[PDB]
């Protein structure tokens, strides 16, 4: 009989059960997260097992369909996800071992125990404990010791399991008509639809290197500045011949430079902008935080919150034995149900977090009419940008003064803005070189062009080349430093944090252009402007129904991955940074080390 | 207390009584009163013979599908409303009596049909729908689907997924010794004054 028409019945029968089954799954997960009790642990496990058994039944039949003759581009894309073979292509004795290794890696990664040798009864963990040692301290003989102790007792056991895990994962990916395992992670950044909007997996590898060279002078200037600031406090340990050391960034892995902001402040006379006591003096609860901030979403024209969110979702005050997880999360339970899980307090950081969470809620509600297989964005790098757009454009002094939280006599000068521009710069472009590092490293190691022996030597020789981090202590091939990372052992991709930076500033500049704002970009807001609510809405509701390249045309001028706004947002930052390194050499040589 | 399902709706025949289209229009607990035909305030003017009442239990915003000339999944093969509709449709919120904690799966709706329904026709028979040339020849298999699927009802589904009971009233405008009428007038009485009496 006919084959094109009959698939419509299958996709109309499968999603009807998928929607409500995922609804109970999300409800059980929310109940478990809200109620930390053994009385709510069997139901979520049962729901997860039932949903997992249901998913396999509906995906096995979606191979008989010849997805090369179906005309429509919607049902074909919908069935492409059902056509994925997943991890059920290996042998059962092999899949069992792979799953055991995957679980063992995660379990061991949370069992970091390092005791002080002189007091063998005192170990510290990656949680509060050893984390506090390097987070806020003024010492040099302890920060390197903590780094060495952490990286010398966790890698020696993750390495043997990771060695087999990489090979087995590559072999499993080989069965899905992919050259390596990299295609399994680059499969979402690929479209073969409308002519002129097409994309290939081989384009991103050359496009990721052509967008990073244009922001390298900025990183050189920032590195020179931070090295100069560190030379003013630390003793004769750092040298201008090389670069900044490894155990002084402010974290175990150096992903974020937020802990170095106090040490590298240009002027200490002027404090930061704090309004937490401004809200406290007026006796603001956490509900007024959610009520006074939702109004920013109303002036732009975005739809109002549906009834039930203010009743079902808990806002704050765990208080007594009724303990709940305080991790900020937004849950789209389905069936038109949305909730928030957060222990909101009186904090401007909590204000930004609440903006981020209800931005996730708004983005989830934007494409609520899409089918269950299309209840997601075009790609996964859009959620964080949508959440952080208002986080960036909600801390401006004009926005706070409009609400009525600061006196109308405020007299901000240039230096008041330089610190605000530097605080976000140390966080934003301070993690970009560590993302292109780890992601490209994993891509090349999964490609397999290097032998077994030459694994760790390349990492240190390339880290010095681009990021500029020298070896504080010498390590041999048996060490495994990167295994001590969250997204290295749980099979988590590390590319979602790199396009997010580009998306945030692209969207911000695109919305600021058509908003009647003249001057800089750090003091631009879309409040009281419905014109900024029409351009954005045409893309939020699309969801996964349209490719991301196509979706990047109705809000932004160009579709190409060109990093324009980062060279424009931090324009005063560059203008002030080009005048401070007048006599200090900028750069580094990959030969100097603290020990040699 | 209970209403018929949307795929197999009840049929109530009302005649030989005084029609009161006043409290129905005046009650504030009616989410939908829009209807096409005579004026909702002119209802107590005409006299008819038969009145037909149909009861449905559907899910939220789907209620807009019931209109004279709208397509979908309820107005195409579950209940076809005549194009020349001469009645009115009333829908209200029923989240307090139709929704049960844990799910209320006792309201089945037909999802599979081989042809669009003509106005005022019922298909109560339940048979596995064949899609292609693969008869089941058994109980269940491939190209085998059950048209009836149960609705899911819980007290917390938001707005667009809550149950909304619907009643459709059909008035027939035939020429006959009509009996169904309404209260005409109750004007007072005067004496010994030249008046016009009716
Ligand atoms: C939640 O946990 C408490 C104990 O912490 C228990 O008494 C209660 O039954 C659980 N479930 C609900 C719905 O509160």
Short mmCIF file of N, CA and C in Angstrom, two decimals, chain A residues 1-2 6 9-14 16-17 19-20 23-24 27 58 61 64-65 306-307 312 334-337 339 368 375, chain B residues 59 73 77 102 105 109 111-112 129 131-134 142-143 145-149 151-154 156-161:
data_model
loop_
_atom_site.label_atom_id
_atom_site.label_comp_id
_atom_site.label_asym_id
_atom_site.label_seq_id
_atom_site.Cartn_x
_atom_site.Cartn_y
_atom_site.Cartn_z
N UNK A 1 0.83 -1.20 0.00
CA UNK A 1 0.00 0.00 0.00
C UNK A 1 0.86 1.25 0.00
N UNK A 2 0.23 2.41 0.19
CA UNK A 2 0.96 3.66 0.25
C UNK A 2 1.84 3.71 1.49
N UNK A 6 0.67 6.68 5.33
CA UNK A 6 0.51 5.88 6.54
C UNK A 6 1.40 6.35 7.69
N UNK A 9 -0.35 8.66 10.38
CA UNK A 9 -1.05 7.99 11.47
C UNK A 9 -0.09 7.60 12.59
N UNK A 10 1.08 7.08 12.23
CA UNK A 10 2.04 6.65 13.25
C UNK A 10 2.54 7.84 14.07
N UNK A 11 2.88 8.94 13.40
CA UNK A 11 3.34 10.12 14.15
C UNK A 11 2.22 10.83 14.89
N UNK A 12 0.97 10.69 14.46
CA UNK A 12 -0.15 11.24 15.21
C UNK A 12 -0.57 10.37 16.39
N UNK A 13 -0.25 9.08 16.36
CA UNK A 13 -0.52 8.20 17.48
C UNK A 13 0.62 8.14 18.49
N UNK A 14 1.87 8.29 18.04
CA UNK A 14 3.01 8.21 18.95
C UNK A 14 3.12 9.44 19.84
N UNK A 16 0.90 11.56 20.79
CA UNK A 16 -0.19 11.70 21.75
C UNK A 16 0.16 11.04 23.08
N UNK A 17 0.75 9.84 23.02
CA UNK A 17 1.21 9.18 24.24
C UNK A 17 2.52 9.78 24.74
N UNK A 19 3.55 12.87 24.71
CA UNK A 19 3.34 14.13 25.43
C UNK A 19 2.95 13.87 26.88
N UNK A 20 1.92 13.06 27.10
CA UNK A 20 1.47 12.89 28.48
C UNK A 20 2.40 11.98 29.27
N UNK A 23 4.83 14.09 30.44
CA UNK A 23 4.22 14.93 31.47
C UNK A 23 4.34 14.28 32.85
N UNK A 24 3.94 13.00 32.97
CA UNK A 24 4.12 12.35 34.27
C UNK A 24 5.59 12.22 34.63
N UNK A 27 6.59 15.53 36.05
CA UNK A 27 5.96 15.71 37.36
C UNK A 27 6.66 14.89 38.43
N UNK A 58 8.55 2.58 20.05
CA UNK A 58 8.13 3.48 18.98
C UNK A 58 9.27 3.87 18.05
N UNK A 61 10.13 0.60 14.96
CA UNK A 61 9.34 0.53 13.73
C UNK A 61 9.71 1.64 12.76
N UNK A 64 11.61 0.89 8.90
CA UNK A 64 10.96 0.41 7.69
C UNK A 64 10.54 1.54 6.77
N UNK A 65 10.37 2.75 7.31
CA UNK A 65 9.99 3.89 6.49
C UNK A 65 11.19 4.35 5.67
N UNK A 306 0.79 32.46 32.69
CA UNK A 306 -0.45 31.72 32.85
C UNK A 306 -0.73 31.45 34.32
N UNK A 307 -2.01 31.35 34.66
CA UNK A 307 -2.41 31.07 36.03
C UNK A 307 -1.98 29.66 36.42
N UNK A 312 1.44 26.53 41.94
CA UNK A 312 2.10 25.23 41.94
C UNK A 312 3.59 25.34 42.27
N UNK A 334 4.88 20.28 30.52
CA UNK A 334 3.95 19.90 29.48
C UNK A 334 2.51 20.13 29.89
N UNK A 335 1.62 19.91 28.92
CA UNK A 335 0.18 20.12 29.10
C UNK A 335 -0.12 21.55 29.52
N UNK A 336 0.73 22.49 29.11
CA UNK A 336 0.58 23.88 29.50
C UNK A 336 1.03 24.20 30.91
N UNK A 337 1.82 23.34 31.54
CA UNK A 337 2.22 23.51 32.92
C UNK A 337 3.69 23.91 33.00
N UNK A 339 6.77 25.48 35.85
CA UNK A 339 7.10 25.69 37.25
C UNK A 339 8.55 26.14 37.37
N UNK A 368 5.18 26.52 22.58
CA UNK A 368 4.33 25.53 23.23
C UNK A 368 3.37 24.85 22.26
N UNK A 375 9.29 20.19 20.36
CA UNK A 375 9.23 21.08 21.53
C UNK A 375 10.64 21.37 22.05
N UNK B 59 -11.68 19.06 25.66
CA UNK B 59 -10.49 19.53 26.36
C UNK B 59 -10.20 20.98 25.95
N UNK B 73 -10.48 17.88 14.31
CA UNK B 73 -10.58 16.49 14.72
C UNK B 73 -11.86 16.19 15.49
N UNK B 77 -14.93 14.36 12.05
CA UNK B 77 -15.31 12.95 12.11
C UNK B 77 -15.78 12.52 13.49
N UNK B 102 -4.53 12.34 39.45
CA UNK B 102 -3.95 11.14 38.88
C UNK B 102 -4.41 10.82 37.47
N UNK B 105 -9.37 8.97 32.86
CA UNK B 105 -9.33 8.41 31.52
C UNK B 105 -10.65 7.74 31.14
N UNK B 109 -12.41 9.62 23.12
CA UNK B 109 -12.75 10.33 21.89
C UNK B 109 -12.21 9.55 20.71
N UNK B 111 -10.44 9.02 17.23
CA UNK B 111 -9.36 9.67 16.51
C UNK B 111 -9.16 9.17 15.09
N UNK B 112 -9.69 8.00 14.74
CA UNK B 112 -9.50 7.42 13.42
C UNK B 112 -10.85 7.19 12.76
N UNK B 129 -8.85 0.44 13.12
CA UNK B 129 -8.74 1.17 11.86
C UNK B 129 -7.55 0.65 11.07
N UNK B 131 -4.91 1.05 8.06
CA UNK B 131 -4.25 2.09 7.26
C UNK B 131 -3.37 1.39 6.23
N UNK B 132 -3.94 1.09 5.07
CA UNK B 132 -3.21 0.41 4.02
C UNK B 132 -3.89 -0.86 3.55
N UNK B 133 -3.11 -1.93 3.38
CA UNK B 133 -3.62 -3.23 2.96
C UNK B 133 -3.11 -4.33 3.88
N UNK B 134 -3.18 -4.09 5.19
CA UNK B 134 -2.69 -5.04 6.19
C UNK B 134 -3.78 -5.28 7.23
N UNK B 142 0.34 -4.87 13.10
CA UNK B 142 0.92 -3.78 12.34
C UNK B 142 -0.11 -3.26 11.34
N UNK B 143 -0.14 -1.93 11.18
CA UNK B 143 -1.26 -1.22 10.56
C UNK B 143 -2.56 -1.50 11.31
N UNK B 145 -4.78 0.09 14.61
CA UNK B 145 -4.92 1.21 15.53
C UNK B 145 -6.35 1.29 16.03
N UNK B 146 -6.51 1.66 17.30
CA UNK B 146 -7.83 1.83 17.89
C UNK B 146 -8.26 3.29 17.79
N UNK B 147 -9.40 3.59 17.16
CA UNK B 147 -9.81 4.99 17.01
C UNK B 147 -10.05 5.71 18.33
N UNK B 148 -10.51 5.00 19.36
CA UNK B 148 -10.89 5.62 20.62
C UNK B 148 -9.68 5.72 21.54
N UNK B 149 -9.37 6.94 21.97
CA UNK B 149 -8.32 7.20 22.94
C UNK B 149 -8.92 8.01 24.09
N UNK B 151 -9.26 10.64 27.11
CA UNK B 151 -8.73 11.94 27.49
C UNK B 151 -8.07 11.87 28.86
N UNK B 152 -7.05 12.72 29.04
CA UNK B 152 -6.40 12.83 30.33
C UNK B 152 -6.86 14.07 31.07
N UNK B 153 -7.30 13.90 32.32
CA UNK B 153 -7.89 14.99 33.08
C UNK B 153 -7.34 14.99 34.49
N UNK B 154 -6.66 16.06 34.86
CA UNK B 154 -6.19 16.33 36.21
C UNK B 154 -6.54 17.76 36.58
N UNK B 156 -4.86 20.19 37.56
CA UNK B 156 -3.85 21.19 37.21
C UNK B 156 -3.33 20.91 35.81
N UNK B 157 -4.02 21.44 34.81
CA UNK B 157 -3.55 21.44 33.42
C UNK B 157 -3.44 22.84 32.83
N UNK B 158 -3.57 23.88 33.65
CA UNK B 158 -3.47 25.24 33.12
C UNK B 158 -4.83 25.74 32.67
N UNK B 159 -4.91 26.17 31.41
CA UNK B 159 -6.14 26.71 30.84
C UNK B 159 -6.55 25.94 29.59
N UNK B 160 -5.62 25.72 28.67
CA UNK B 160 -5.93 25.10 27.39
C UNK B 160 -6.05 23.59 27.41
N UNK B 161 -5.83 22.95 28.56
CA UNK B 161 -5.95 21.50 28.68
C UNK B 161 -6.96 21.11 29.75
#
